[PDB]
């Protein structure tokens, strides 16, 4: 049977999340490689935090790439087969590209640090943010945003599961969209503790910086199919992969569609590779015939080896 690996992004991290892998030689070597690339002790940052350091986005993005990739390398060290198709959620798309051999891990490290810096400084402080809307289908959330937009730009920017949508834009747009969403019967419509309007058109300046940065990155044709967040496309051309990463930052993460794409390829097993269990839960919601597992410690890895 064919399987997919999906890789998590920001928001899946926690202090101590790799403790259970502390004595797996490849996890140690991956944390060493990350520290060498970034100039700080990534192992201890993850193990000890504090959470306020671990949650700075300039740390969170390389931390989540490292932790999830560590988990991929442990899967291999254990003799796990290559998945037939991969994807990842926002930052996680980078990890997927690394697993697929498109971007060397050593290159991916300063790339995602830079991406974090770019995305955090694209718009002036306090201009915008993000919110989570629960209970409304995608087209209703789009209608909510189109209506709210008279008060400021606001867009539906993460399609995560049925009835689970994140929006992003101006502070005013986000507030009005929550209010409208509630009126239309949303189970929940609440601002997220995020300081920048990620995956909105307001983030175009981040895309522009990413384009300049990726110009100098050696991207290779993947050895595993990667389905991208922005277009739900599987592309092999290095230039196209780069462009999908550029547009990704200021465009919608079509996560539901990526999972459905994977399913239409005849994959029935979808394994979340990395900590936090976020993607595991979304797979269940997107398509209950899919069979989930997760690799985040040695025990879960062995159960995933079975599936």
mmCIF file of N, CA, C and O in Angstrom, residues 74-149:
data_model
loop_
_atom_site.group_PDB
_atom_site.id
_atom_site.type_symbol
_atom_site.label_atom_id
_atom_site.label_comp_id
_atom_site.label_asym_id
_atom_site.label_seq_id
_atom_site.Cartn_x
_atom_site.Cartn_y
_atom_site.Cartn_z
ATOM 1 N N UNK A 74 14.587 9.779 11.527
ATOM 2 C CA UNK A 74 14.386 8.609 12.442
ATOM 3 C C UNK A 74 13.585 7.502 11.768
ATOM 4 O O UNK A 74 13.831 6.291 11.964
ATOM 5 N N UNK A 75 12.572 7.907 11.010
ATOM 6 C CA UNK A 75 11.781 6.956 10.238
ATOM 7 C C UNK A 75 12.708 6.159 9.304
ATOM 8 O O UNK A 75 12.652 4.946 9.267
ATOM 9 N N UNK A 76 13.589 6.846 8.590
ATOM 10 C CA UNK A 76 14.546 6.196 7.682
ATOM 11 C C UNK A 76 15.542 5.273 8.397
ATOM 12 O O UNK A 76 15.769 4.155 7.896
ATOM 13 N N UNK A 77 16.158 5.789 9.484
ATOM 14 C CA UNK A 77 17.107 5.061 10.343
ATOM 15 C C UNK A 77 16.482 3.759 10.833
ATOM 16 O O UNK A 77 17.186 2.761 10.962
ATOM 17 N N UNK A 78 15.172 3.780 11.076
ATOM 18 C CA UNK A 78 14.400 2.626 11.484
ATOM 19 C C UNK A 78 14.032 1.714 10.330
ATOM 20 O O UNK A 78 13.384 0.686 10.544
ATOM 21 N N UNK A 79 14.411 2.071 9.106
ATOM 22 C CA UNK A 79 14.055 1.254 7.948
ATOM 23 C C UNK A 79 12.700 1.535 7.302
ATOM 24 O O UNK A 79 12.209 0.731 6.492
ATOM 25 N N UNK A 80 12.101 2.678 7.619
ATOM 26 C CA UNK A 80 10.808 3.036 7.040
ATOM 27 C C UNK A 80 10.944 3.365 5.558
ATOM 28 O O UNK A 80 11.900 3.951 5.150
ATOM 29 N N UNK A 81 9.970 2.987 4.764
ATOM 30 C CA UNK A 81 10.011 3.242 3.303
ATOM 31 C C UNK A 81 9.782 4.721 2.991
ATOM 32 O O UNK A 81 9.273 5.454 3.798
ATOM 33 N N UNK A 82 10.171 5.133 1.802
ATOM 34 C CA UNK A 82 9.898 6.467 1.318
ATOM 35 C C UNK A 82 8.398 6.576 1.047
ATOM 36 O O UNK A 82 7.814 5.659 0.499
ATOM 37 N N UNK A 83 7.750 7.662 1.505
ATOM 38 C CA UNK A 83 6.374 7.854 1.100
ATOM 39 C C UNK A 83 6.263 8.078 -0.404
ATOM 40 O O UNK A 83 7.251 8.383 -1.069
ATOM 41 N N UNK A 84 5.078 7.868 -0.954
ATOM 42 C CA UNK A 84 4.903 8.049 -2.393
ATOM 43 C C UNK A 84 4.545 9.497 -2.760
ATOM 44 O O UNK A 84 4.662 9.894 -3.912
ATOM 45 N N UNK A 85 4.085 10.258 -1.773
ATOM 46 C CA UNK A 85 3.702 11.638 -1.962
ATOM 47 C C UNK A 85 3.777 12.348 -0.615
ATOM 48 O O UNK A 85 3.503 11.755 0.415
ATOM 49 N N UNK A 86 4.204 13.608 -0.638
ATOM 50 C CA UNK A 86 4.299 14.400 0.558
ATOM 51 C C UNK A 86 3.653 15.771 0.368
ATOM 52 O O UNK A 86 3.410 16.190 -0.758
ATOM 53 N N UNK A 87 3.366 16.422 1.494
ATOM 54 C CA UNK A 87 2.896 17.796 1.547
ATOM 55 C C UNK A 87 3.162 18.276 2.968
ATOM 56 O O UNK A 87 3.399 17.468 3.893
ATOM 57 N N UNK A 88 3.134 19.581 3.155
ATOM 58 C CA UNK A 88 3.184 20.176 4.502
ATOM 59 C C UNK A 88 2.447 21.504 4.574
ATOM 60 O O UNK A 88 2.273 22.190 3.568
ATOM 61 N N UNK A 89 2.027 21.852 5.779
ATOM 62 C CA UNK A 89 1.147 22.974 6.023
ATOM 63 C C UNK A 89 1.990 24.227 6.311
ATOM 64 O O UNK A 89 2.595 24.355 7.402
ATOM 65 N N UNK A 90 2.026 25.117 5.288
ATOM 66 C CA UNK A 90 2.714 26.403 5.303
ATOM 67 C C UNK A 90 4.210 26.148 5.501
ATOM 68 O O UNK A 90 4.888 25.698 4.555
ATOM 69 N N UNK A 91 4.761 26.416 6.691
ATOM 70 C CA UNK A 91 6.175 26.099 6.949
ATOM 71 C C UNK A 91 6.499 24.645 6.607
ATOM 72 O O UNK A 91 7.534 24.363 6.071
ATOM 73 N N UNK A 92 5.592 23.738 6.903
ATOM 74 C CA UNK A 92 5.782 22.327 6.655
ATOM 75 C C UNK A 92 6.021 21.937 5.203
ATOM 76 O O UNK A 92 6.520 20.822 4.931
ATOM 77 N N UNK A 93 5.676 22.832 4.276
ATOM 78 C CA UNK A 93 5.927 22.568 2.849
ATOM 79 C C UNK A 93 7.426 22.525 2.590
ATOM 80 O O UNK A 93 7.922 21.811 1.709
ATOM 81 N N UNK A 94 8.154 23.319 3.353
ATOM 82 C CA UNK A 94 9.603 23.325 3.288
ATOM 83 C C UNK A 94 10.181 21.991 3.715
ATOM 84 O O UNK A 94 11.062 21.475 3.079
ATOM 85 N N UNK A 95 9.679 21.446 4.799
ATOM 86 C CA UNK A 95 10.134 20.151 5.332
ATOM 87 C C UNK A 95 9.862 19.013 4.293
ATOM 88 O O UNK A 95 10.671 18.109 4.074
ATOM 89 N N UNK A 96 8.681 19.072 3.686
ATOM 90 C CA UNK A 96 8.300 18.168 2.644
ATOM 91 C C UNK A 96 9.306 18.248 1.499
ATOM 92 O O UNK A 96 9.744 17.218 1.005
ATOM 93 N N UNK A 97 9.684 19.466 1.079
ATOM 94 C CA UNK A 97 10.672 19.637 -0.006
ATOM 95 C C UNK A 97 12.037 19.061 0.350
ATOM 96 O O UNK A 97 12.783 18.546 -0.533
ATOM 97 N N UNK A 98 12.372 19.147 1.637
ATOM 98 C CA UNK A 98 13.618 18.570 2.121
ATOM 99 C C UNK A 98 13.558 17.064 2.096
ATOM 100 O O UNK A 98 14.454 16.441 1.564
ATOM 101 N N UNK A 99 12.505 16.487 2.657
ATOM 102 C CA UNK A 99 12.288 15.039 2.595
ATOM 103 C C UNK A 99 12.314 14.531 1.142
ATOM 104 O O UNK A 99 12.848 13.464 0.871
ATOM 105 N N UNK A 100 11.754 15.317 0.211
ATOM 106 C CA UNK A 100 11.688 14.966 -1.237
ATOM 107 C C UNK A 100 12.992 15.226 -1.973
ATOM 108 O O UNK A 100 13.096 14.990 -3.171
ATOM 109 N N UNK A 101 14.005 15.710 -1.282
ATOM 110 C CA UNK A 101 15.324 15.903 -1.932
ATOM 111 C C UNK A 101 15.387 17.152 -2.804
ATOM 112 O O UNK A 101 16.328 17.358 -3.548
ATOM 113 N N UNK A 102 14.370 18.007 -2.734
ATOM 114 C CA UNK A 102 14.383 19.226 -3.535
ATOM 115 C C UNK A 102 15.309 20.315 -2.945
ATOM 116 O O UNK A 102 15.900 21.086 -3.679
ATOM 117 N N UNK A 103 15.389 20.384 -1.613
ATOM 118 C CA UNK A 103 16.168 21.394 -0.920
ATOM 119 C C UNK A 103 17.001 20.679 0.150
ATOM 120 O O UNK A 103 16.462 19.925 0.930
ATOM 121 N N UNK A 104 18.298 20.904 0.183
ATOM 122 C CA UNK A 104 19.105 20.274 1.221
ATOM 123 C C UNK A 104 18.715 20.854 2.594
ATOM 124 O O UNK A 104 18.498 22.067 2.735
ATOM 125 N N UNK A 105 18.612 19.995 3.593
ATOM 126 C CA UNK A 105 18.282 20.431 4.951
ATOM 127 C C UNK A 105 19.171 21.568 5.419
ATOM 128 O O UNK A 105 18.677 22.531 5.966
ATOM 129 N N UNK A 106 20.460 21.491 5.102
ATOM 130 C CA UNK A 106 21.421 22.510 5.501
ATOM 131 C C UNK A 106 21.056 23.836 4.875
ATOM 132 O O UNK A 106 21.324 24.872 5.476
ATOM 133 N N UNK A 107 20.461 23.809 3.669
ATOM 134 C CA UNK A 107 20.005 25.051 3.021
ATOM 135 C C UNK A 107 18.651 25.494 3.520
ATOM 136 O O UNK A 107 18.365 26.693 3.572
ATOM 137 N N UNK A 108 17.822 24.543 3.885
ATOM 138 C CA UNK A 108 16.477 24.853 4.327
ATOM 139 C C UNK A 108 16.468 25.634 5.654
ATOM 140 O O UNK A 108 15.540 26.389 5.942
ATOM 141 N N UNK A 109 17.518 25.461 6.446
ATOM 142 C CA UNK A 109 17.562 26.047 7.774
ATOM 143 C C UNK A 109 17.604 27.595 7.721
ATOM 144 O O UNK A 109 16.683 28.233 8.221
ATOM 145 N N UNK A 110 18.627 28.204 7.078
ATOM 146 C CA UNK A 110 18.607 29.670 6.988
ATOM 147 C C UNK A 110 17.472 30.196 6.079
ATOM 148 O O UNK A 110 17.033 31.334 6.236
ATOM 149 N N UNK A 111 16.937 29.350 5.195
ATOM 150 C CA UNK A 111 15.850 29.766 4.317
ATOM 151 C C UNK A 111 14.605 30.039 5.140
ATOM 152 O O UNK A 111 13.977 31.062 4.949
ATOM 153 N N UNK A 112 14.250 29.137 6.058
ATOM 154 C CA UNK A 112 13.039 29.313 6.838
ATOM 155 C C UNK A 112 13.215 30.338 7.945
ATOM 156 O O UNK A 112 12.253 31.007 8.308
ATOM 157 N N UNK A 113 14.434 30.494 8.457
ATOM 158 C CA UNK A 113 14.732 31.637 9.350
ATOM 159 C C UNK A 113 14.458 32.952 8.627
ATOM 160 O O UNK A 113 13.761 33.849 9.135
ATOM 161 N N UNK A 114 14.994 33.056 7.422
ATOM 162 C CA UNK A 114 14.745 34.233 6.600
ATOM 163 C C UNK A 114 13.238 34.412 6.295
ATOM 164 O O UNK A 114 12.692 35.502 6.451
ATOM 165 N N UNK A 115 12.567 33.326 5.899
ATOM 166 C CA UNK A 115 11.136 33.376 5.646
ATOM 167 C C UNK A 115 10.399 33.956 6.858
ATOM 168 O O UNK A 115 9.515 34.809 6.719
ATOM 169 N N UNK A 116 10.735 33.463 8.047
ATOM 170 C CA UNK A 116 10.117 33.974 9.284
ATOM 171 C C UNK A 116 10.331 35.473 9.424
ATOM 172 O O UNK A 116 9.375 36.212 9.699
ATOM 173 N N UNK A 117 11.555 35.931 9.208
ATOM 174 C CA UNK A 117 11.899 37.366 9.305
ATOM 175 C C UNK A 117 11.078 38.206 8.293
ATOM 176 O O UNK A 117 10.481 39.234 8.669
ATOM 177 N N UNK A 118 11.043 37.736 7.033
ATOM 178 C CA UNK A 118 10.283 38.350 5.973
ATOM 179 C C UNK A 118 8.799 38.491 6.285
ATOM 180 O O UNK A 118 8.225 39.537 6.091
ATOM 181 N N UNK A 119 8.172 37.399 6.694
ATOM 182 C CA UNK A 119 6.751 37.384 6.982
ATOM 183 C C UNK A 119 6.382 38.270 8.205
ATOM 184 O O UNK A 119 5.311 38.912 8.244
ATOM 185 N N UNK A 120 7.281 38.326 9.187
ATOM 186 C CA UNK A 120 7.008 39.095 10.399
ATOM 187 C C UNK A 120 7.153 40.612 10.160
ATOM 188 O O UNK A 120 6.576 41.394 10.877
ATOM 189 N N UNK A 121 7.956 41.028 9.179
ATOM 190 C CA UNK A 121 8.188 42.431 8.938
ATOM 191 C C UNK A 121 7.620 42.993 7.609
ATOM 192 O O UNK A 121 7.987 44.110 7.198
ATOM 193 N N UNK A 122 6.751 42.240 6.935
ATOM 194 C CA UNK A 122 6.197 42.675 5.645
ATOM 195 C C UNK A 122 5.342 43.938 5.819
ATOM 196 O O UNK A 122 5.425 44.859 5.004
ATOM 197 N N UNK A 123 4.553 43.991 6.890
ATOM 198 C CA UNK A 123 3.688 45.134 7.141
ATOM 199 C C UNK A 123 4.002 45.741 8.502
ATOM 200 O O UNK A 123 4.523 45.051 9.406
ATOM 201 N N UNK A 124 3.691 47.030 8.656
ATOM 202 C CA UNK A 124 4.016 47.647 9.925
ATOM 203 C C UNK A 124 3.306 47.016 11.118
ATOM 204 O O UNK A 124 2.231 46.434 10.995
ATOM 205 N N UNK A 125 3.933 47.124 12.269
ATOM 206 C CA UNK A 125 3.428 46.531 13.503
ATOM 207 C C UNK A 125 1.987 46.956 13.766
ATOM 208 O O UNK A 125 1.647 48.138 13.593
ATOM 209 N N UNK A 126 1.164 45.998 14.170
ATOM 210 C CA UNK A 126 -0.220 46.262 14.527
ATOM 211 C C UNK A 126 -1.191 46.450 13.355
ATOM 212 O O UNK A 126 -2.380 46.651 13.567
ATOM 213 N N UNK A 127 -0.696 46.397 12.126
ATOM 214 C CA UNK A 127 -1.560 46.566 10.942
ATOM 215 C C UNK A 127 -2.598 45.438 10.814
ATOM 216 O O UNK A 127 -3.794 45.675 10.572
ATOM 217 N N UNK A 128 -2.155 44.217 11.039
ATOM 218 C CA UNK A 128 -3.048 43.106 10.830
ATOM 219 C C UNK A 128 -2.840 41.924 11.726
ATOM 220 O O UNK A 128 -1.959 41.919 12.598
ATOM 221 N N UNK A 129 -3.636 40.891 11.451
ATOM 222 C CA UNK A 129 -3.613 39.644 12.204
ATOM 223 C C UNK A 129 -4.400 38.544 11.540
ATOM 224 O O UNK A 129 -4.694 38.593 10.332
ATOM 225 N N UNK A 130 -4.752 37.552 12.358
ATOM 226 C CA UNK A 130 -5.392 36.330 11.930
ATOM 227 C C UNK A 130 -6.518 35.936 12.901
ATOM 228 O O UNK A 130 -6.484 36.313 14.108
ATOM 229 N N UNK A 131 -7.494 35.174 12.403
ATOM 230 C CA UNK A 131 -8.563 34.652 13.253
ATOM 231 C C UNK A 131 -9.021 33.288 12.795
ATOM 232 O O UNK A 131 -8.957 32.964 11.616
ATOM 233 N N UNK A 132 -9.551 32.519 13.738
ATOM 234 C CA UNK A 132 -10.034 31.164 13.501
ATOM 235 C C UNK A 132 -11.531 31.174 13.492
ATOM 236 O O UNK A 132 -12.155 31.646 14.422
ATOM 237 N N UNK A 133 -12.109 30.642 12.427
ATOM 238 C CA UNK A 133 -13.549 30.560 12.283
ATOM 239 C C UNK A 133 -13.941 29.105 12.224
ATOM 240 O O UNK A 133 -13.470 28.339 11.365
ATOM 241 N N UNK A 134 -14.820 28.726 13.142
ATOM 242 C CA UNK A 134 -15.267 27.346 13.256
ATOM 243 C C UNK A 134 -16.748 27.284 13.013
ATOM 244 O O UNK A 134 -17.480 28.124 13.538
ATOM 245 N N UNK A 135 -17.176 26.276 12.247
ATOM 246 C CA UNK A 135 -18.569 26.017 11.994
ATOM 247 C C UNK A 135 -19.116 26.478 10.636
ATOM 248 O O UNK A 135 -20.225 26.130 10.322
ATOM 249 N N UNK A 136 -18.377 27.270 9.842
ATOM 250 C CA UNK A 136 -18.885 27.732 8.529
ATOM 251 C C UNK A 136 -18.092 27.104 7.375
ATOM 252 O O UNK A 136 -16.876 26.977 7.474
ATOM 253 N N UNK A 137 -18.771 26.749 6.282
ATOM 254 C CA UNK A 137 -18.126 26.124 5.130
ATOM 255 C C UNK A 137 -17.271 27.170 4.400
ATOM 256 O O UNK A 137 -17.362 28.349 4.703
ATOM 257 N N UNK A 138 -16.414 26.750 3.482
ATOM 258 C CA UNK A 138 -15.468 27.670 2.899
ATOM 259 C C UNK A 138 -16.128 28.850 2.181
ATOM 260 O O UNK A 138 -15.648 29.970 2.294
ATOM 261 N N UNK A 139 -17.200 28.606 1.435
ATOM 262 C CA UNK A 139 -17.771 29.681 0.628
ATOM 263 C C UNK A 139 -18.434 30.711 1.549
ATOM 264 O O UNK A 139 -18.455 31.895 1.227
ATOM 265 N N UNK A 140 -18.970 30.258 2.693
ATOM 266 C CA UNK A 140 -19.571 31.175 3.672
ATOM 267 C C UNK A 140 -18.483 32.036 4.304
ATOM 268 O O UNK A 140 -18.646 33.213 4.459
ATOM 269 N N UNK A 141 -17.345 31.455 4.622
ATOM 270 C CA UNK A 141 -16.278 32.238 5.175
ATOM 271 C C UNK A 141 -15.835 33.248 4.133
ATOM 272 O O UNK A 141 -15.620 34.400 4.454
ATOM 273 N N UNK A 142 -15.749 32.855 2.877
ATOM 274 C CA UNK A 142 -15.369 33.822 1.833
ATOM 275 C C UNK A 142 -16.349 34.990 1.763
ATOM 276 O O UNK A 142 -15.919 36.179 1.660
ATOM 277 N N UNK A 143 -17.641 34.672 1.868
ATOM 278 C CA UNK A 143 -18.718 35.698 1.855
ATOM 279 C C UNK A 143 -18.580 36.625 3.057
ATOM 280 O O UNK A 143 -18.634 37.847 2.914
ATOM 281 N N UNK A 144 -18.351 36.044 4.240
ATOM 282 C CA UNK A 144 -18.070 36.833 5.437
ATOM 283 C C UNK A 144 -16.937 37.836 5.227
ATOM 284 O O UNK A 144 -17.089 39.027 5.540
ATOM 285 N N UNK A 145 -15.835 37.375 4.651
ATOM 286 C CA UNK A 145 -14.669 38.244 4.380
ATOM 287 C C UNK A 145 -14.966 39.310 3.329
ATOM 288 O O UNK A 145 -14.568 40.465 3.491
ATOM 289 N N UNK A 146 -15.714 38.946 2.290
ATOM 290 C CA UNK A 146 -16.053 39.882 1.240
ATOM 291 C C UNK A 146 -16.918 41.013 1.838
ATOM 292 O O UNK A 146 -16.674 42.188 1.629
ATOM 293 N N UNK A 147 -17.848 40.646 2.694
ATOM 294 C CA UNK A 147 -18.668 41.605 3.402
ATOM 295 C C UNK A 147 -17.885 42.480 4.417
ATOM 296 O O UNK A 147 -18.034 43.722 4.429
ATOM 297 N N UNK A 148 -17.068 41.835 5.255
ATOM 298 C CA UNK A 148 -16.226 42.513 6.236
ATOM 299 C C UNK A 148 -15.217 43.498 5.599
ATOM 300 O O UNK A 148 -14.750 44.466 6.250
ATOM 301 N N UNK A 149 -14.871 43.247 4.328
ATOM 302 C CA UNK A 149 -13.774 43.952 3.667
ATOM 303 C C UNK A 149 -14.000 45.447 3.492
ATOM 304 O O UNK A 149 -13.038 46.194 3.307
#
